[PDB]
Design a protein around this ligand. Structure first.
Ligand SMILES: CCCCCCCCCCCCCCCCCC(=O)OC[C@H](COP(=O)([O-])OCC(O)COP(=O)([O-])OC[C@@H](COC(=O)CCCCCCCCCCCCCCCCC)OC(=O)CCCCCCCCCCCCCCCCC)OC(=O)CCCCCCCCCCCCCCCCC
Ligand SMILES: CCCCCCCCCCCCCCCCCC(=O)OC[C@H](COP(=O)([O-])OCC[N+](C)(C)C)OC(=O)CCCCCCCCCCCCCCCCC
Ligand SMILES: CCCCCCCCCCCCCCCCCC(=O)OC[C@H](COP(=O)(O)OCCN)OC(=O)CCCCCCCCCCCCCCCCC
Ligand SMILES: CCCCCCCCCCCCCCCCCC(=O)OC[C@H](COP(=O)(O)OCCN)OC(=O)CCCCCCCCCCCCCCCCC
Ligand SMILES: CCCCCCCCCCCCCCCCCC(=O)OC[C@H](COP(=O)(O)OCCN)OC(=O)CCCCCCCCCCCCCCCCC
Ligand SMILES: Nc1nc2c(ncn2[C@@H]2O[C@H](COP(=O)(O)OP(=O)(O)OP(=O)(O)O)[C@@H](O)[C@H]2O)c(=O)[nH]1
Lengths: 49, 139, 320, 98, 55, 175, 347, 87, 61, 120
């Protein structure tokens, strides 16, 4: 290994990254969920569908 | 705005003495303000020097205003066209030539028209057309 | 994390780690006056982290492999060049000193960081406060010029102000005829070419200014080279004292947060070492600087931030 | 508008001029800086007492209270000037010329 | 004469020169509180009274 | 003058106000405003603000300026200012008497003083009302409501003062 | 200073500025203003150098004077109305008296004299707070009382700000000073439209915050204070000065770089109000801002400047500062122009 | 009436006597601390009337808030040298 | 190679004021530390004639 | 302008009746621009930290894109709401003040003169 000392990012910080995907997957699933009933509610609020 | 109304109320090309007195009052008033700031931000020597600088700034500003009012009114009724924008423009060098002589260098005097002459002409366009510089909020 | 605000908030102090064996030792002396060996002796007697004397490739022996880099790639100066040609046009003389002063300054920061993170004292040779004696001596014979001095001391005041002075200074006194006769015994062909004039200037600068100017900041532990040989003598009275002089025996965790803020930021310790003073001997134009930096880029490891070099073998780049 | 109100109103106007028209010693401005709020405090009490605005008796105290922190902030900065130059003289208060 | 002596000194250089002089004293004050706050005094006085902004 | 007693109280308030605002020595400037501070209390006292009048004595008069005069003590100019040292301070003082005595006389006239605002400088005694206060004191009840109605006012005042003490020590320790 | 009190001293500054915009009482409006000032001074004095003390004195003297002047804008209002509610001012004299009070706290007309000097004295981190966060509070009050504001009085403050703000930057070499002068020029822009449509003032404020944040942390990352110090930054970190050039042009207002969005909206709003001379001179003198803008860009990355031998040291070590939210700030401050119709969100 | 009449005669009786008897950083630090320790005294000076309010609960919890806040401000000065007159 | 700025070009953008003038002739560049060098020490080491000559630091001897 | 309308409970990012509008589709060109800006933030972040921008961590960039896409969609609804509100109350007003906007009569170009100006 080139570096004499392990650098602060020179390792996969599993807890941090696993949180990052955890943030995104929860974010998208909320997003696709929220669009669903918001569309569905708009369908029935005006009497479309 | 007593001074502005005083100058505007005098009909164009009429009562040149009134116009000249009205014009030099505005010039002198502006000359006082800039001199006061100049003394403020740049402290002069003993009070005689302070009033000397005040005298210079007021005299130049009053001179520019006085003759400009004279040329503008004169240009209006001698040519018998009061609505002419050029009426004020020739005042621009008139005011401009005055500045060029007060500093005793016509290089500033030459540039003095092209900007003051246009602006003096520009003001006349504003009065005729109806331009508003500080427009009241309408929309 | 490091002393970054969160660590200080959670209660991590620094006075808690400090003990009686927490001092800065400047075991200086003369040109090859044997002070290098005394540095190890003092370090191993009281268990202080020893720092080898700062050179041209010291910073090279801090990062990456901790191995010397190309002189063109790191420093562009050569002490041997100054040793051979006394007054050249390439400006190796002054540029050697200023790079030396920066290397010593970085060494000082590394020393303080170790002390402020362990509480264990540190010994250093030719501390950054000493450095000015060489440069002024180089000016005495004409190695550098008047305009050269202005850049160096300007860097000195803007940098060395915040660093606290040492606690212990060991001036190994060796007299001029001995040094001017010992340099033949070394045998390294570069250091034979040493003028007695340059030597004569360095010692008189030391005793008359190096010790007194910082005597009020820490006590002067004068030691002849005869005293330097008897390491048992010098180890008693370093402990026999307190070093009440200077501002070090007054600081608390309030200033220590500031001190470990700067030393941890290695870029910050030497950010002021690059003052835009356009001295001819150190000013490098864009063309040479660009090519050299581009040469620095595609070197191993240096291409990216540390730990982010796929060429070295840092796996998980797509995740880290 | 009653005369007593006029007298306090002009009292500030000279105080505003007194602080703005500056003198060599920085102390005197600090006296006038919080002097100007004394007229503010005095007149404030006048309206509320006159108008029987019982709840608005809140203001006269708290107005002075935070005016005190400013004065407390005031001379505390002043001593630092005195500890760096020797006198609070404001013509030397120009180190930021550049 | 015309192209690179007058046509560059009428619009370009004159405006540069005009902007030069104005920026000369705008950026060059004295750093004295007395002069500053005094300039405040006129500014407040002239604002209420003589631009007639109160009317 | 009995009818316009507060007017005399008010006039004395400004003349001392002008004197210390004329930038005299800080000790002398202290005198100029403390007498102004005391006389202003009489104005509030005469209107009925018993606590407010007495309270400005304790925190402003016997408060503010004691530590203020304390600071001028350590300033200790080798050349302490007296009113005769410079003619600028006398010029301000004779000025401060000038326009004050001017428009009060114009106030003594037809009473259409219209500098900035429109003032009718009649006898100050007219502005009061004819409504009794019963048993409760109007001033006392208002301030006492700080702990019943001044919920947000007391919190920010308490919080700022705690911030006030920490900032004072933080900026005086000098790192 | 100690971080825990340094945290809460800054934290109260948000709290004081928060209180200004969330209180309907005139007294509480001043309450947050001077709690804000109380905690601002130590952050100015964080470095504790004679210049830092110099900067704090000017800032305190200016800010304290305005706030005491602010009370009597309230007091006369109370004197002629008996209302402490934050709405339409009822007294013309108090109204101008208020506008000068708030303008000095914002520093647009020759009240601006402290803005360059104070900025230079304080550290770069403290400069960030002064020109970004301690500017919402005066604008918060102006937004609420905008309808009442005197049109001639406010616009005159605006032009004198941009005119001086344009001229002042043309001669300063310090990066902090030119930053301050450009901040003055932008401040004239927002307050210019302020009487007309407050949504555009807020949009200008929200947009103008982005570069001023982005530019400051970039300088802090560069650790540069003067133009020559900025010149050397290309060698060690050629990337950082490259992004600084992009955001520097965005501050100038050249489409499609977002930053022309506020200027575009201001011109359109003023034109709808029949005021057409106001925008033209306003836009024309914005070129004055662009000159020393490009001048910084000329010496930053566009033409590599001479470096120094000691800069070879800096290449070996990597940055330790965290500069949080920098990547988002740069991107949000240069390419958000196609999302201009998001203006209705601010309404 | 009587209040100034008193005030008048005491001063003159003192004025006559003085004429007849003649013709015949830490020091700063404690100063501001007192000032900042004096203002909230004026906050809690109205309190005997405050105890007459209908809502004792808010009054009791609030006057207690200032006193403990006074205690905290004093405590902060005590621990962070503060009250210690810098030697 | 293309032209690159030399030292003289840097000196253009290197003064205390970018466009020098007589009024700003003596203006000096700010110190790089942003710390003006400390002036003469304002220590009140007043020696009190207690005859016992004895100095104090405002409180402390 | 809006600020002060009847039924305008403050500190609300999406009033209830705003949901009676067509929600933006996830393939909205405005929305995909939000995602593009988020991606550009990811490149800058790695460039700022001196990392292999193209693939210097797929976790940091993924959050950058998702966060910008999220904040965009909510901003879009409020964007769509206010513009719908801006046009809505207009139609109520335009029928509330008929006399202020009288329909001018329509006369074909067979009547209106335009005094044609020749070009030479
Ligand atoms: C609009 C769209 C854009 C904007 C969106 C919103 C985000 C805006 C901010 C973006 C980031 C700014 C930033 O950090 O820039 C880097 C820049 C430099 O960062 P740096 O290099 O780390 O150095 C900072 C210090 O010098 C380092 O000093 P230190 O070593 O002592 O560390 C101090 C730091 C380190 O953190 C700590 O010490 C943590 C706290 C420990 C003690 C307290 C524990 C409990 C904390 C609870 C907090 C809740 O703590 C703090 O900063 C404390 C204050 C945090 C906020 C508290 C608010 C609640 C009260 O940040 C600052 O200078 C901070 C300025 C204050 C905050 C930002 C103000 C500017 C923006 C205002 C307007 C925003 C839009 C309004 C509309
Ligand atoms: C923090 C400690 C102090 C605040 C909480 C405890 C006291 C609550 C209180 O008095 O509330 C009064 C009021 C609610 O009133 P209330 O209903 O308790 O009493 C009303 C009394 N009359 C009818 C006479 C007016 O609430 C507040 O003042 C809340 C302020 C914000 C609290 C949080 C700050 C952070
Ligand atoms: C239609 C109604 C009006 C009719 C009358 C005509 C208009 C009014 C009169 C003319 C006013 C504009 C002309 C300039 C007047 C002020 C001149 C002045 O200040 O001169 C002093 C000085 C110039 O000399 P200086 O550069 O100092 O060099 C010598 C140094 N020892 O100055 C300077 O150095 C500073 C630069 C000049 C001052 C700043 C600009 C002042 C004018 C602003 C616009 C005024 C408009 C007035 C009319 C409209 C509004 C009412
Ligand atoms: C709004 C007011 C803004 C005031 C800004 C004044 C400083 C910037 C310009 C400057 O320095 O001077 C302008 C003007 C003329 O200055 P002058 O008397 O020519 O002296 C120059 C050398 N000190 O000096 C002035 O003080 C005039 C400023 C008002 C001009 C209208
Ligand atoms: C609106 C008009 C335009 C406005 C913006 C203009 C910007 C430029 C203007 C001129 C700037 C000043 C002059 C040039 C300065 C150069 C600065 C610099 O640092 O240059 C050298 C440097 C060396 O590269 P280095 O930093 O080592 O990074 C290599 C990649 N990791 O180079 C760099 O650091 C540059 C690194 C760039 C990396 C780009 C990566 C792109 C990845 C694209 C992925 C696309 C994926 C598409 C997928 C499609 C299907 C979904
Ligand atoms: N210009 C300059 N050269 C320095 C400085 N400090 C050390 N040197 C050089 O460092 C080199 C090694 O020091 P020497 O004393 O000659 O040899 P050494 O092996 O360190 O021996 P000891 O001093 O006994 O430890 C010499 O070329 C010195 O001139 C300095 O501050 N400036």
């Amino acid at each position: 290994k080139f570096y004499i000392r392990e650098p602060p990012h020179g390792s996969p910080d599993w807890l941090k990254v696993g949180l990052t995907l955890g943030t995104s997957v929860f974010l998208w699933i909320y997003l696709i969920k929220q669009h669903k009933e918001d569309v569905l509610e708009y369908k029935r609020r005006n009497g479309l569908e | 705005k007593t001074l502005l109304h005083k100058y505007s109320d005098i009909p164009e090309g009429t009562e040149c003495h009134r116009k000249a007195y009205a014009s030099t009052s505005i010039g002198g008033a502006t000359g006082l303000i800039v001199s006061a700031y100049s003394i403020a931000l740049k402290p002069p020597a003993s009070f005689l020097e302070g009033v000397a600088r005040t005298g210079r700034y007021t005299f130049t500003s009053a001179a520019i205003g006085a003759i400009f009012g004279l040329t503008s009114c004169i240009s209006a009724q001698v040519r018998e066209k009061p609505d002419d924008p050029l009426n004020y423009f020739i005042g621009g060098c008139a005011g401009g030539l005055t500045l060029g002589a007060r500093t005793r260098s016509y290089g500033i005097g030459a540039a003095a028209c092209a900007y003051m002459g246009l602006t003096a002409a520009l003001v006349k366009m504003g009065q005729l057309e109806g331009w508003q510089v500080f427009a009241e909020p309408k929309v | 994390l490091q002393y970054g605000p969160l660590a200080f908030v959670l209660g991590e102090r620094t006075t808690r780690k400090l003990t009686e064996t927490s001092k800065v030792i400047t075991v200086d002396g003369n040109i090859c006056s044997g002070k290098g060996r005394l540095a190890r002796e003092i370090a191993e007697k009281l268990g202080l982290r020893h720092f080898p004397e700062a050179g041209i490739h010291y910073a090279d022996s801090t990062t990456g492999d901790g191995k010397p880099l190309d002189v063109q790639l790191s420093g562009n100066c050569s002490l041997e060049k100054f040793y051979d040609d006394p007054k050249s046009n390439d400006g190796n003389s002054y540029r050697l000193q200023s790079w030396l002063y920066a290397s010593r300054l970085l060494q000082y920061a590394d020393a303080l960081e170790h002390l402020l993170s362990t509480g264990q004292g540190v010994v250093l040779e030719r501390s950054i406060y000493s450095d000015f004696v060489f440069l002024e001596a180089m000016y005495r014979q004409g190695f550098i010029r008047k305009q050269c001095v202005e850049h160096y001391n300007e860097v000195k005041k803007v940098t060395a102000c915040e660093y606290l002075p040492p606690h212990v200074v060991v001036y190994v006194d060796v007299p001029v005829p001995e040094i001017q006769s010992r340099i033949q015994k070394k045998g390294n062909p570069h250091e034979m070419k040493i003028t007695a004039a340059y030597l004569q200037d360095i010692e008189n600068a030391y005793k008359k200014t190096f010790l007194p100017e910082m005597s009020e900041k820490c006590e002067v532990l004068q030691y002849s080279a005869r005293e330097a040989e008897d390491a048992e003598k010098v180890v008693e009275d370093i402990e026999y004292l307190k070093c009440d002089k200077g501002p070090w025996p007054d600081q608390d965790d309030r200033t220590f947060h500031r001190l470990r803020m700067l030393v941890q930021n290695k870029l910050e310790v030497l950010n002021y070492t690059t003052i835009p003073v356009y001295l001819p001997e150190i000013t490098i134009g864009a063309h040479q600087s660009d090519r050299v930096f581009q040469k620095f880029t595609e070197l191993p490891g240096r291409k990216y931030s540390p730990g982010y070099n796929e060429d070295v073998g840092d796996k998980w780049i797509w995740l880290k | 508008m009653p005369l007593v109100y006029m007298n306090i109103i002009m009292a500030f106007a000279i105080a505003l001029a007194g602080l703005l028209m500056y003198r060599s010693h920085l102390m005197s401005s600090l006296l006038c800086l919080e002097g100007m709020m004394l007229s503010l405090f005095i007149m404030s009490t006048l309206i509320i007492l006159n108008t029987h605005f019982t709840l608005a008796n809140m203001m006269p105290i708290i107005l002075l209270v935070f005016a005190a922190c400013e004065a407390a902030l005031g001379l505390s900065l002043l001593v630092m000037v005195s500890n760096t130059y020797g006198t609070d003289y404001v013509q030397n208060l120009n180190l930021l010329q550049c | 004469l015309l192209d690179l002596i007058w046509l560059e000194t009428i619009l370009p250089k004159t405006t540069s020169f005009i902007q030069m002089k104005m920026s000369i004293m705008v950026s060059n004050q004295k750093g004295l509180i007395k002069l500053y706050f005094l300039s405040f005094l006129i500014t407040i006085m002239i604002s209420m009274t003589l631009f007639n902004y109160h009317e | 003058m009995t009818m316009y007693i507060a007017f005399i109280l008010s006039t004395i308030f400004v003349i001392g106000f002008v004197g210390f605002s004329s930038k005299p020595s800080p000790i002398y400037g202290g005198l100029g405003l403390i007498v102004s501070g005391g006389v202003g209390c009489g104005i509030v006292l005469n209107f009925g603000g018993s606590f407010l009048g007495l309270m400005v004595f304790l925190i402003y008069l016997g408060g503010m300026l004691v530590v203020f005069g304390y600071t001028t003590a350590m300033a200790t100019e080798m050349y302490p200012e007296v009113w005769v040292s410079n003619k600028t301070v006398f010029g301000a003082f004779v000025s401060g008497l000038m326009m004050e005595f001017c428009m009060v006389y114009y106030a003594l006239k037809e009473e259409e003083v219209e500098i900035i605002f429109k003032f009718n400088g009649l006898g100050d005694w007219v502005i009061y009302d004819t409504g009794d206060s019963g048993f409760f004191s109007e001033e006392a009840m208002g301030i006492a409501a700080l702990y019943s109605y001044g919920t947000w006012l007391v919190i920010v005042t308490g919080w700022s003062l705690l911030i006030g003490v920490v900032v004072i020590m933080e900026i005086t320790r000098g790192n | 200073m100690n971080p825990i009190i340094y945290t809460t001293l800054i934290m109260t500054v948000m709290s004081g500025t928060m209180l200004v915009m969330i209180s309907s009482h005139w007294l509480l409006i001043w309450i947050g203003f001077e709690m804000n000032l109380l905690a601002m001074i130590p952050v100015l004095m964080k470095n504790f150098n004679p210049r830092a003390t110099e900067a704090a004195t000017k800032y305190f003297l200016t800010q304290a004077t305005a706030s005491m002047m602010l009370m009597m804008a309230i007091i006369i209002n109370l004197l002629y109305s008996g209302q402490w509610t934050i709405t339409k001012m009822f007294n013309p004299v108090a109204m101008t008296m208020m506008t000068m009070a708030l303008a000095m706290k914002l520093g647009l007309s020759p009240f601006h004299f402290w803005v360059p000097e104070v900025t230079q004295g304080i550290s770069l981190q403290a400069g960030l707070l002064l020109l970004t966060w301690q500017k919402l509070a005066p604008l918060s009050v102006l937004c609420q009382i905008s309808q009442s504001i005197n049109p001639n009085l406010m616009l005159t403050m605006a032009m004198l700000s941009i005119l001086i703000g344009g001229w002042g930057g043309l001669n300063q070499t310090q990066l902090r000073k030119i930053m301050a002068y450009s901040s003055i020029a932008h401040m004239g822009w927002m307050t210019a439209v302020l009487p007309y449509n407050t949504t555009m003032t807020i949009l200008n404020l929200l947009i103008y915050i982005t570069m001023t944040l982005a530019m400051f942390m970039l300088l802090i990352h560069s650790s540069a204070t003067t133009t020559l110090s900025l010149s050397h930054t290309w060698n060690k970190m050629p990337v950082i000065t490259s992004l600084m050039m992009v955001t520097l042009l965005s501050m100038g207002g050249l489409p499609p770089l977002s930053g022309f969005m506020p200027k575009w909206m201001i011109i359109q709003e003023m034109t709808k109000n029949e005021s057409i001379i106001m925008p033209t001179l306003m836009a024309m003198t914005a070129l004055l801002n662009l000159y020393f803008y490009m001048r910084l860009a000329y010496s930053s990355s566009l033409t590599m400047f001479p470096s120094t031998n000691n800069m070879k040291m800096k290449w070996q070590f990597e940055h330790t500062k965290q500069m949080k939210l920098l990547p988002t700030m740069i991107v949000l401050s240069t390419l958000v122009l196609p999302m201009t119709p998001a203006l209705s969100s601010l309404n | 009436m009587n209040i100034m009449l008193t005030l008048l005669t005491n001063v003159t009786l003192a004025s006559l006597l003085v004429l007849i008897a003649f013709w015949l950083m830490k020091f700063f630090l404690v100063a501001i601390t007192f000032l900042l320790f004096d203002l909230e005294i004026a906050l809690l000076l109205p309190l005997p009337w405050a105890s007459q309010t209908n809502n004792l609960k808010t009054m009791l919890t609030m006057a207690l808030f200032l006193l403990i806040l006074l205690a905290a401000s004093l405590a902060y000065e005590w621990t962070q040298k503060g009250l210690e007159w810098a030697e | 190679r293309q032209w690159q700025p030399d030292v003289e070009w840097a000196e253009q953008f290197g003064g205390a004021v970018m466009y020098p003038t007589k009024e700003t002739a003596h203006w000096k560049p700010p110190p790089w530390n942003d710390v003006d060098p400390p002036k003469d020490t304002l220590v009140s080491n007043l020696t009190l004639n207690f005859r016992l000559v004895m100095e104090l630091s405002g409180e402390m001897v | 302008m809006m600020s002060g309308r009847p039924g305008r409970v403050p500190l609300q990012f999406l009033p209830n009746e705003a949901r009676s509008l067509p929600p933006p589709k996830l393939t909205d060109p405005r929305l995909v621009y939000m995602g593009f800006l988020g991606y550009c933030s990811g490149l800058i972040d790695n460039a700022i930290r001196r990392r292999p921008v193209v693939s210097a961590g797929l976790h940091r960039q993924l959050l950058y894109v998702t966060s910008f896409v999220f904040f965009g969609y909510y901003l879009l609804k409020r964007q769509d709401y206010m513009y719908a509100l801006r046009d809505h109350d207009m139609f109520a007003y335009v029928k509330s003040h008929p006399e202020d906007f009288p329909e001018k009569d329509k006369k074909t170009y067979g009547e209106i003169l335009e005094e044609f100006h020749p070009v030479r």
